[PDB]
Write a structure and sequence with these properties.
PDB class: transcription/dna
Number of domains: 1
Subcellular location: Nucleus
Helix content: 10-25%
Radius of gyration: 14 Å
Strand content: over 45%
CATH superfamily: DNA-binding pseudobarrel domain
Organism: Arabidopsis thaliana (Mouse-ear cress)
CATH topology: At1g16640 B3 domain
Number of helices: 3
Distance between the termini: 40 Å
Strand order of the largest sheet: 1-6-7-3-4-5-2
Oligomer: monomer
Shape: globular
Subunit structure: Interacts with SNL1.
Protein name: B3 domain-containing transcription repressor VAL1
Amino acid sequence: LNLNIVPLFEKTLSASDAGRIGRLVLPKACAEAYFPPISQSEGIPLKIQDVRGREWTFQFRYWPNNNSRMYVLEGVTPCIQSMMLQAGDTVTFSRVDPGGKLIMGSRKAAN
DNA sequence: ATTCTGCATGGAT
DNA sequence: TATCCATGCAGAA
């Protein structure tokens, strides 16, 4: 029974990502790199656990963009606001190996 | 007015 | 020139 937390990537929140809309933008590069692959514009549900138990479930989804894709987690506001985040705070996504569990955390604006 | 969608745009680099 | 994500924006309800 030997486990490790492996950083995947971080996102520093925009107005949009922090705002009322509820969708958080993932750099395409990063999404394809560390989240499941998905081939439909409307993706798959994705359960990410926070440090203190709470499973959040977002639809992980893309759209066509230019000739590529734009990625988002949808329905984040509950998660965000539980964690008290504003634009300029940072959300870190990580993976627990061996296994494929997705976990997350966040930290507050530099100031 | 408002919110949800599903993109499309274009400023930043 | 190029990429590409923050934000715009036009339905639909």
